[PDB]
Amino acid sequence: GVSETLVENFLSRAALVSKRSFEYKDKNFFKWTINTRSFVQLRRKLELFTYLRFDAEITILTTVAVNGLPDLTLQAMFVPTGALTPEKQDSFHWQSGSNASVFFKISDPPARITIPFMCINSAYSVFYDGFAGFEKNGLYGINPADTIGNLCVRIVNEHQPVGFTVTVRVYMKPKHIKAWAPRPPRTLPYMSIANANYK
Amino acid sequence: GVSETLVENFLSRAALVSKRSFEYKDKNFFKWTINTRSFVQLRRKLELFTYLRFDAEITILTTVAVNGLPDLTLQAMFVPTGALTPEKQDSFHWQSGSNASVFFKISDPPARITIPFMCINSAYSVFYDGFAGFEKNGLYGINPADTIGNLCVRIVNEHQPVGFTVTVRVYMKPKHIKAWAPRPPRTLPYMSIANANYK
Amino acid sequence: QLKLGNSAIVTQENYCCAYGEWPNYLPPTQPETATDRFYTLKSVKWETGSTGWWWKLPDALNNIGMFGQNVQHHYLYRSGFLIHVQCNATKFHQGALLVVAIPEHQRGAHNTNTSPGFDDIMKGEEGGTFNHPYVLDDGTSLACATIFPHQWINLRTNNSATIVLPWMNAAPMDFPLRHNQWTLAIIPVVPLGTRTTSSMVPITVSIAPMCCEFNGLR
Amino acid sequence: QLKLGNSAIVTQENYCCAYGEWPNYLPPTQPETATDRFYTLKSVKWETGSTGWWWKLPDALNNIGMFGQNVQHHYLYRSGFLIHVQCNATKFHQGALLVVAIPEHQRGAHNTNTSPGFDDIMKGEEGGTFNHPYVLDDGTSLACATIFPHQWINLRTNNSATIVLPWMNAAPMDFPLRHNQWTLAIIPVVPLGTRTTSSMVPITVSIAPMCCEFNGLR
Amino acid sequence: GVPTYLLPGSGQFLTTDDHSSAPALPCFNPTPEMHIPGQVRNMLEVVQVESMMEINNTESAVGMERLKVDISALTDVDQLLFNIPLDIQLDGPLRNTLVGNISRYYTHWSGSLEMTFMFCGSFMAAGKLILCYTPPGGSCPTTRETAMLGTHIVWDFGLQSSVTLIIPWISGSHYRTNANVGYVTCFMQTNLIVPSESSDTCSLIGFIAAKDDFSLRLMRDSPDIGQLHAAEAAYQ
Amino acid sequence: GVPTYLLPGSGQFLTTDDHSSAPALPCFNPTPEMHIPGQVRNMLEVVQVE
Amino acid sequence: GVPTYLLPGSGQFLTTDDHSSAPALPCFNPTPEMHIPGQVRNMLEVVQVE
Amino acid sequence: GTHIVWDFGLQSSVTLIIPWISGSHYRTNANVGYVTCFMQT
């Protein structure tokens, strides 16, 4: 039983990290800034450590419901750090080749991409005891190198005369987890996703 | 013909173990506490022995009928012993990563998971000549370690304007069956799934 | 002669190693001369119309002696048993006992949906009595009850039966106060009979816990 | 005696190599006798009702001496630390310090959603004070804070604690003016106590930057 | 071509699978692995680190008053100090420890614990305590003479101000809803003897670590956290 | 890639099949096999008892 | 046949993939590789020019 | 205590070894124990 307590076996678990329902007739898509700070259950597992080095295995699961279910084609373009995120459903950045788009359907098995380790440094600073900006307006606890990127998902199809809600569940499973410098488990509840405020 | 009488060949048979039709518009899902005591045909085969050690190979088979058949996405999250079971279709426990969810569709081939051997002890006490609770209110014949878990199945989709019944057939096929201490076959009919009362 | 510890039995008229397993220790304290002794139970008045008797183990020995102390003071137990049942009849009594040791004998009540309580299961030194011995009081069949370890006391042939029970659990150690592994079931298949008297042949049960282990002393 | 560079400490009453790592150089300029010296901070007045003190590193040493010059003139730094905390009490004071060195101690404000500013984090030579030391001012637990490198100053037993911090970063070199790797957190778990006076036991913190590297001189 | 057929369980997203998937950015070399100190390869290394118990399990103990037990002239000759119900699962003295927060991610825990009680009085302060490991099964000792019978160790505090108290094998969630797997009680043995300059009130810090045989399995979610401001800023 | 084609009998749930399927809880070590007395490997051993 | 099952990420067009696909005109021999001067194998060779 | 359940089929006689006593070592010799026999069946 000493092998289930491996940090590989402790953290590599495809937990839900993003869930947003967008209508179709953010305007009719959604972008999700890839952080581990979204849900309180995976965050407290990852706030057990200080430095993490993991490849995320993002599995985009798209459901659909009207108001016959249509068979759509979706795009799940991953906008990395530095590249620009789309502001519209039909913007030019969806056509950008150098971003890692993946084209899938609702009726397919869920799309699955392995986002690599994309920090500038050798590990993700889960807790950063510093400041990003070089002035005093820079936010605390935000490493400039911690940014995974942006997962931008739209419907490739044109406008259809049916109005229908598209709910997208994004499942992240960290891979090849190397973890450094364990921390105490956080006992008090969270107050924001940006910082470690307590009540 | 001495090989078909092997206990591996005698018990590894994907018999129906659960069948519940839930509506969609337990409230609009179903959980099934995984026991072998459900149907009288597989139970009498497994009450031939005292101690069983089997991996269950659960095959969730979902049909659908209205009142065009919609193409839904289902979840078949296995809640083990100790973890919490959902009480609603949209509860937080469906999003819990550490539970073994599997996401499948109606139009796919049936979802199939191999639940491992999950007793605390070295075999499942099919008949437990003891008491679970430490007071005299504890029930007889219920091993605290015999609990497989809970198979909780919902429809991942949001509300759809059609009203339709979803019938789910769960097929369990024990695997790697090691069986100890055979018993007489039960001749009198059952009276309850919890105990061995006779009439 | 069966002498274990201080209690001896000078038995005067054949082991059944139950499932072929001789009881050994766990590969904990090991009382080897304090508890390894024949806790001879009370002899049961076997008339003609007697249905049977059952002693769940170690429920039969939770109140008796050094093993009875080491149940109500320790927390877990690991111990095989050696049951010597002797049914001392003359050459004029007839009958047949299925002295069968049923592992995990989850009993069932008759004609109700309610499970049997603590009072209906954990009898102790007084033992139990089969309400319906044809179905072993668990809905099964007495006719197939020889699948368990058993010896026959056919009073034509023998008066005794010796069953050597191993540690029969999925767990390595278990509760003595809650769980009962075995069940010595003595069921008269062919009832007692003699014309001159409605006779009695008392059936002496002597249960020696072999290779006792214990843990958790309070 | 702890003599590094020109500053010496004649300490008169046990290393904790933090995460088992002795600080080495990067496999840049290397000031080996200019900065590798004990920048003894101001001793803190430890009363009974004191909650704790925290010194973020190298924020505590950005204004002090040759290391303070080489922060405000260079751009990157690579330097382990050697913190010698000494809490000079008599044989009549009682108490216990968790002298713990927390890497990447991202603090949290109490009862607001606003992040802590530059003023609430980058204190310097004056150091900080735990507003809620039971939760380390980051929502975690003091009870589990021994998962970090730490030594106990139990005034019954010892008055000193020596923690040898390595280079703790994902990056090979980082900002001294913006980023603070470690945080020397001294928290009195058992408070100070003596009946005759509401006494003070001043806690001297001496932080020697081991194996300084620097780059980017303007 | 290669004649194939789809099995049941095809096109399913099983969340606990381990399949090599297509990387989003191939031919992208990440930052190389630098030797960062203190790699945790195994969560048992987090658990085996000692961590303070909340051995003041009384009412109106707010914050850091839970981590210490005041002993003084108020404590009688053989009265009581604390009992520690060995319930990693339940809300007690072991809930907010490293052994009691990592093992709330895991259902079955099976191994030897290791308590450590550090005395935090003055150097002149002498006196005896009596630490009593109590197994699972019966009543908790209320008098000191009842505590004389089980496992235990009379602890004077002169030279040795710390006691390693090896709790034996437990196997944890093996008996039942984890109710009670025993106690560690401490009574006053003699009295607390401080001079006229030391404080009349001393204190005890209790640690707990798991030993190297501590095993853990069947991962679940922790019930500790549960319910954010600017939570939708990731979608903005 | 590997050029494949679906046979007849694809995507069927045949109840008597024996195919290795994806375990729900991998990297979960079950309770080890302890020597419980009286293992029945073969149902003829049940039948040959009188 | 060979018993297979579809993974997640099946039937997706990931734009950065590298899979050998069916050529539109097989058994068509292109123009052979002639030594044209100044092959750039690596974009750093473009950058290192002043 | 010490004892031995004695059926009477074949063995109609029981040697019962009383252990070491030392006799007039405890006190007027009052009571140095008993050998009791009850009915079993």
Automatic annotation (TrEMBL), chains C, D:
Acts as a primer for viral RNA replication and remains covalently bound to viral genomic RNA. VPg is uridylylated prior to priming replication into VPg-pUpU. The oriI viral genomic sequence may act as a template for this. The VPg-pUpU is then used as primer on the genomic RNA poly(A) by the RNA-dependent RNA polymerase to replicate the viral genome. During genome replication, the VPg-RNA linkage is removed by the host TDP2, thereby accelerating replication. Protein 2B: Plays an essential role in the virus replication cycle by acting as a viroporin. Creates a pore in the host reticulum endoplasmic and as a consequence releases Ca2+ in the cytoplasm of infected cell. In turn, high levels of cytoplasmic calcium may trigger membrane trafficking and transport of viral ER-associated proteins to viroplasms, sites of viral genome replication. Interacts with protein 3CD. This is Genome polyprotein. The lineage of its organism: Viruses, Riboviria, Orthornavirae, Pisuviricota, Pisoniviricetes. The chain holds residues 84 to 312 of 2188 of the full protein. It comes from the Viruses. It comes from Human enterovirus D68 (EV68). Belongs to the picornaviruses polyprotein family. It is found in: Host cytoplasmic vesicle membrane; Host nucleus; Virion.
From TrEMBL, chains F, G:
It comes from the Viruses. It is found in: Host cytoplasmic vesicle membrane; Host nucleus; Virion. Signal peptide: none annotated. Interacts with capsid protein VP1 and capsid protein VP3 in the mature capsid. Protein 3CD: Involved in the viral replication complex and viral polypeptide maturation. It exhibits protease activity with a specificity and catalytic efficiency that is different from protease 3C. Protein 3CD lacks polymerase activity. Protein 3CD binds to the 5'UTR of the viral genome. Belongs to the picornaviruses polyprotein family. This is Genome polyprotein. It comes from Human enterovirus D68 (EV68). The chain holds residues 318 to 367 of 2188 of the full protein.
